[PDB]
Amino acid sequence: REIVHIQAGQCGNQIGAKFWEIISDEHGIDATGAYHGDSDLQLERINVYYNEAKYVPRAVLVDLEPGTMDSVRSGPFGQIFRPDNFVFGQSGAGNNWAKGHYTEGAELVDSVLDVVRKEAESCDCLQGFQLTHSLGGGTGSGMGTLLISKIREEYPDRIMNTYSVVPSPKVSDTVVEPYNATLSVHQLVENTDETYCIDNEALYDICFRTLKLTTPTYGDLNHLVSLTMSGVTTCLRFPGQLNADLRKLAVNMVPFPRLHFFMPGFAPLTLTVPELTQQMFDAKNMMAACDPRHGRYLTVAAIFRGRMSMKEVDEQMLNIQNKNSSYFVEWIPNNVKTAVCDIPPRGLKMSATFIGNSTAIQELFKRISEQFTAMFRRKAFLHWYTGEGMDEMEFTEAESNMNDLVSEYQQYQEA
Amino acid sequence: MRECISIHVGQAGVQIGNACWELYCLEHGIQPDGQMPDSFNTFFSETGAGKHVPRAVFVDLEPTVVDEVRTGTYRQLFHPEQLITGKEDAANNYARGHYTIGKEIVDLVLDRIRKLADQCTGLQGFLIFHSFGGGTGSGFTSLLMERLSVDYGKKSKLEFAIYPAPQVSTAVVEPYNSILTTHTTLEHSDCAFMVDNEAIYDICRRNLDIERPTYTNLNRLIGQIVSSITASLRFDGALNVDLTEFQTNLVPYPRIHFPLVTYAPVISAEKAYHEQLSVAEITNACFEPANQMVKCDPRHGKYMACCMLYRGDVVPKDVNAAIATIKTKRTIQFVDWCPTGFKVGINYQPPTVVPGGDLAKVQRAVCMLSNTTAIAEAWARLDHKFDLMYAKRAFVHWYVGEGMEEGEFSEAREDLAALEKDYEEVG
Ligand SMILES: Nc1nc2c(ncn2[C@@H]2O[C@H](COP(=O)(O)OP(=O)(O)OP(=O)(O)O)[C@@H](O)[C@H]2O)c(=O)[nH]1
Ligand SMILES: Nc1nc2c(ncn2[C@@H]2O[C@H](COP(=O)(O)OP(=O)(O)O)[C@@H](O)[C@H]2O)c(=O)[nH]1
Ligand SMILES: [Mg+2]
Numbered sequence: 001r002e003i004v005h006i007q008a009g010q011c012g013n014q015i016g017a018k019f020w021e022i023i024s025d026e027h028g029i030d031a032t033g034a035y036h037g038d039s040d041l042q043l044e045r046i047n048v049y050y051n052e053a054k055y056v057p058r059a060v061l062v063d064l065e066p067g068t069m070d071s072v073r074s075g076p077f078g079q080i081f082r083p084d085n086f087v088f089g090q091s092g093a094g095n096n097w098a099k100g101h102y103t104e105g106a107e108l109v110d111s112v113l114d115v116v117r118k119e120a121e122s123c124d125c126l127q128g129f130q131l132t133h134s135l136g137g138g139t140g141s142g143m144g145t146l147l148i149s150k151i152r153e154e155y156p157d158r159i160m161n162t163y164s165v166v167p168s169p170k171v172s173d174t175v176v177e178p179y180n181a182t183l184s185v186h187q188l189v190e191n192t193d194e195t196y197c198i199d200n201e202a203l204y205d206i207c208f209r210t211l212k213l214t215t216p217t218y219g220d221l222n223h224l225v226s227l228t229m230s231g232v233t234t235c236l237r238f239p240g241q242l243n244a245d246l247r248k249l250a251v252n253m254v255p256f257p258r259l260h261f262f263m264p265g266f267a268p269l270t271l272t273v274p275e276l277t278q279q280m281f282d283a284k285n286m287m288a289a290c291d292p293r294h295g296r297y298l299t300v301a302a303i304f305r306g307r308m309s310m311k312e313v314d315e316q317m318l319n320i321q322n323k324n325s326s327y328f329v330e331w332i333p334n335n336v337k338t339a340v341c342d343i344p345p346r347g348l349k350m351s352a353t354f355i356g357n358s359t360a361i362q363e364l365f366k367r368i369s370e371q372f373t374a375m376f377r378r379k380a381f382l383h384w385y386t387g388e389g390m391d392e393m394e395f396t397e398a399e400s401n402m403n404d405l406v407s408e409y410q411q412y413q414e415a
Numbered sequence: 416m417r418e419c420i421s422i423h424v425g426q427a428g429v430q431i432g433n434a435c436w437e438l439y440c441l442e443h444g445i446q447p448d449g450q451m452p453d454s455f456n457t458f459f460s461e462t463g464a465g466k467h468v469p470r471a472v473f474v475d476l477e478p479t480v481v482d483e484v485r486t487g488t489y490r491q492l493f494h495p496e497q498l499i500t501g502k503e504d505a506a507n508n509y510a511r512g513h514y515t516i517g518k519e520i521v522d523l524v525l526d527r528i529r530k531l532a533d534q535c536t537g538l539q540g541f542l543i544f545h546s547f548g549g550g551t552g553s554g555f556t557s558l559l560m561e562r563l564s565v566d567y568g569k570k571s572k573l574e575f576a577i578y579p580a581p582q583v584s585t586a587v588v589e590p591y592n593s594i595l596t597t598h599t600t601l602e603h604s605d606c607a608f609m610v611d612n613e614a615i616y617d618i619c620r621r622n623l624d625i626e627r628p629t630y631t632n633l634n635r636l637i638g639q640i641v642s643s644i645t646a647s648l649r650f651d652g653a654l655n656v657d658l659t660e661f662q663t664n665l666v667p668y669p670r671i672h673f674p675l676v677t678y679a680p681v682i683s684a685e686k687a688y689h690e691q692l693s694v695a696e697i698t699n700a701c702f703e704p705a706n707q708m709v710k711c712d713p714r715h716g717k718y719m720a721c722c723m724l725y726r727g728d729v730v731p732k733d734v735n736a737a738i739a740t741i742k743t744k745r746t747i748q749f750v751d752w753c754p755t756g757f758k759v760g761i762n763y764q765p766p767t768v769v770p771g772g773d774l775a776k777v778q779r780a781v782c783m784l785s786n787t788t789a790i791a792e793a794w795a796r797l798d799h800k801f802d803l804m805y806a807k808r809a810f811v812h813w814y815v816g817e818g819m820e821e822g823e824f825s826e827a828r829e830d831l832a833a834l835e836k837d838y839e840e841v842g
Contacts, residue, residue: 001502125502241585247506252586255809299587310627314582331807333590333800334581415807 002123003048003236003246004116005130006147008062009140011165012133013072014218018226019132020057021077023237025346026230029055033080041343044239051122057081060119062112062147064089064104064139085119087112093138097180098388100142109143113150120155128159128193128246132229135184136167136177136200145187152191159246161194163229166368168200168289171221176381178371179395185368186398189405193250195261196232197361198225202289210269210284228264228287230345231353235303242339243301252337253299253357258405259412261361263288265354273308276352277316281324285354288364295360295413296329300336306350310340331415362409369402417537417657418457419648420528421471421544424559425552426480427577428544429473430630433484434638434769435544436469439649440492442642442767448491454651460534470531472497474524474559476516476551477504497531499524505550507586509595512554514818521558525566532567539658540571542645543604548579548589553596560603571658573606575641578709578793580612583630588810590800591824598827601834606661606672608644608784610637611709611793621705622681623773635772640678640708643782646762647724654722654760664722664758665786670837671719675790676708677701677783682775691778694729698737701783702747709793714746716789717842719753725761727779734759750841788842791835798835801828 007016024030027046028037033054035043050057059081061072069088072078089108093099120126129151133140148160164184167177188195203224207216235243243249254260264287267279280302283291304313317338321328328335345351375381376399382392423432439458445451449466459467471493475481481500484490501520505512532538541563545552560572579589586592600607615636619628647655655661666672679700680692692700700706701723702713725734738757741747749755768774804810805824815821 245504245506247508248586251507251588251810251813254813255807257812314627331803332587332809333803334584335587337584337587412807 001048001125001127001245002058003128003130004058004060004120004123004126005049005132006060006062006116006144007132008144008147009133009137010063010065010068011137012131012140012144013061013063013068015163015165015222015225015229016059016132017072017075017077018222019229020059021075022226022230022346023049023233024077024080026343027237029080031077031080041238045237048236058119059085060112060116061086061088062108062143064100064108064143065092066090085115087115093142095174095176095180096138096384096388097142097183098385098390100138100140101146102389105139105143105146109146109150112147113154116151126158128161129155130161130163132163134165134167135181136165136172136174137180141180141184145184145191148191149187159193159250160191161246162188162192163196163198164188165198165200165225166364168204170204171200175375176384178368178375179381179385181368182372182398182402183394185365186401189258189401193254193260194246196228196264196355197261197288197364198228198264199287199289199364202287205289206269206284224266224269224287227266227345231266231303231305231351232264232355234305234341234343234345234353235339238341238343240339240341242337253301253355255298255332255357256408256412258408259298259357261357263290263292263356263358263361265356267352267354268348270348271350273312274316276304276350277320280352280354281320288361290360290363292356292358292360293327294363295358295409296327297356297358298329298332298335298412299357300328301355302336302338303341303353303355304339305341305352306344306348307342308340308350313338313340359409359413362406362413365402365406365409369399369406372399416456417539418470418535419539419542419658420531420535421458421469421542422528422559423471423473424543424545424556425475425549426477427546427549427552429475429480429484430634431544431575431577431637431641432471432473433487433489434634435641436471436492437489438638438642438767438769439469440489441769442764447489454649457648458645468492468494470535472499472524472527472531474499474520474555476501476512476520476555478502497527499527505554507548507588507592508550508813508817509554509592510814510817510819512550513558517551517555517558521555521562524559525562528563529566538570540573541567542573542575544575546577546579547593547596548577548584548586550592552577553592557596557599560600564603571606571662572604573608573658573661574600574604575608575610578609578611580616582616583612588813590797590804591810591814593797594801594827594831595823598830601670601830604672605669606666606674608674608676609709609793610640610676614708614710618681618706623683624685625773632773635769635774636681639768639774640676640782643678643724643726643766643780644676644784646726646764647760650762650764652760652762654724654758665720665784667719667753667786670834671786671841673790674784674786675711675713677706677785678708679706679781680777681706682777684773684775687775691728694725694733694779695737695740697779697781698723698741701781702741709790711789711792713785713787713789716787717748717750719750719786719841720758721783721785722758722760724782724784725759725779726764726766726781727777728765729761729763729779731761734761788838791838794831794835798828798831
């Protein structure tokens, strides 16, 4: 019934802080942890993400840079988390995956595991974990995946979920990005049950083109990430029948053991039900920067929020499924599931969220492959990895397994 | 004196049981505390203080549904020991609710059922309520049936299963669970009454004029239907006086125990200005396909047996005239290997409806239970949805990785294949 939330690295912390802030504003919890809302619907299932003692988040904060402590503590909601759950090391990893996976991650991982055990053992019935991080760093991309390996070796029966973000050239353009992204995908493929492939390319495109911000900072992307997290967690936060817990969501949306990489989407990006339904499936609102019309959706979850006619929602869902029937697989009957919630998000009087397991996500896995190959033929910076105890056979296996995943997605695309 | 024990499994089973037992309380006059200022003992038990305790066991693997009853209006009617609950649910997975999660609580549930059974003297059998599309209601129900057939081998085990519909479906693997539980319950059960969700949804949208029906309306209508079925066992009638009579009248062969149920009339509360319907009009409405609970075309199929159960202001001579009128329609074709003839049992107790509900009280009503081959049309709809998925092995790992062999997916399907043939050979 309860979910332990882990956040690692600079990006992981800077998106998780916004996530906790936005869901606290939705629930009514102020910066002091005291409930100041107006509805019991807000606190019907608040124990999923909070512990009562005043309400305290279940967050476990991890980093190898001590400064990110203050950067989270100086935030509006920095004083509500347990001060004991801040496990931040001293020597940072920088931008090297091997440093966060073999040398510096393996030194703090024991303390982080003990903290996670202390937080999890208090749950009456723990349902799973979630972990917000980045595939483009050295602390998150490596240490979080090592943490997932340890947790799955320690909690095999619990659903493990992630909110990974992949790097983009227009955001950081670091030369070592594809190595970290590939090696992190290689670990998320085997040791994860659910993944929300957030793309910095999609966030930058949305902020620049649609929102007309000339130079979108990290705050602009983090706002969209927080909205995405709130939309995809509103089912697990409020009472309902669709996607009640993590395992039901996984059974609903994951057809095959490896095809568990999802495509978020949110609307409106900052207006009636048909406009929401048209924008929700539209490619401009995708957070993975791929065209959903390139491939075929395997499973779709549409979550509407606000005061709307549920009859109108159902009619629009059927109309879209009829008009776009050419993009849904015929071998998964009734693969589009619609849920409605009466609590709108922060600042929106009406909102819609889309979670789609689709084959077009392989497009993204192509990019990380291509950017890898362009610097793997010449061995651009591989000596930065073998000096940390890594081996190039791991690089070859990572590339091979990512390519095999792409091939599987393509097989199920034209099937 | 013979008594029956109800078993409610899963969210759907418990939520249908709430409406059912509420309606039983209104019908008999029992107050929510169990005080009632005959045959009603078939479903209730007497204590020293005079409190009436239902013979109802509420089983769930998640506390959300049961705790709605432990603190609801009828929280004092059921003993806390009868409301069994676990911490971990099946998560829309038959294997979880059958082999691992349900195995943790099956011994406790059986111990409770044995405790209720020892308090009985002439026990007939069990009326098990569940659903097909749910992990609990499909896995734990089949496990419990397999366990009960070893202990209560001689006791009839009826079913009231909820046939999944896309309009209210909660999982995409509902056909998997529907086929899997059907394979493992087809031998232990002996008369299963199936209700299709989409039929109830259509009736609520059409007759009750509800734009977006919820589980409250569907549960109220299904409780009405189950009460109409069991009124023969509760009010000391002249037909279906026992559970074995249900098998005798509706199930000529052990593998065709799937009666089709029709209830008339369904009238919105605001439409009470209507004149009361005659016996002929409701008798004719029995055979229309707007009042069916599992949508199909019985005019194509061949009837095996038909039991009609009337309630309210009903005159036997009017029923006989309706029978004579009905028996002269070319669309009603009986199998030649079964004697051609209806069975009619009339109950004089007025129907009862929940005040504040959308169903208006009626002066008379009729429930028609016919064993027909056309119900197999509802089976094929499942198998197609099965064949579209197992062909690509979609969601199969969710079942094999939780303690069940893959070869049981085919076998179960193969069984239903024979089941389909069982309706083609007979018809
Ligand atoms: N008519 C009606 N149908 C229901 C009701 N509750 C659930 N259902 C149907 O049952 C299906 C799911 O089966 P459930 O019995 O609810 O599953 P469960 O008992 O919660 O067990 P799990 O699958 O492990 O969660 C849904 O698709 C619904 O259509 C109800 O109260 N009334
Ligand atoms: N959208 C978004 N992306 C970020 C943010 N911070 C870092 N990133 C991405 O993450 C990558 C840097 O990894 P980082 O998390 O800083 O490394 P680590 O902290 O050592 O694990 C860059 O390529 C960025 O694209 C943020 O606040 N928002
Ligand atoms: Mg349930």
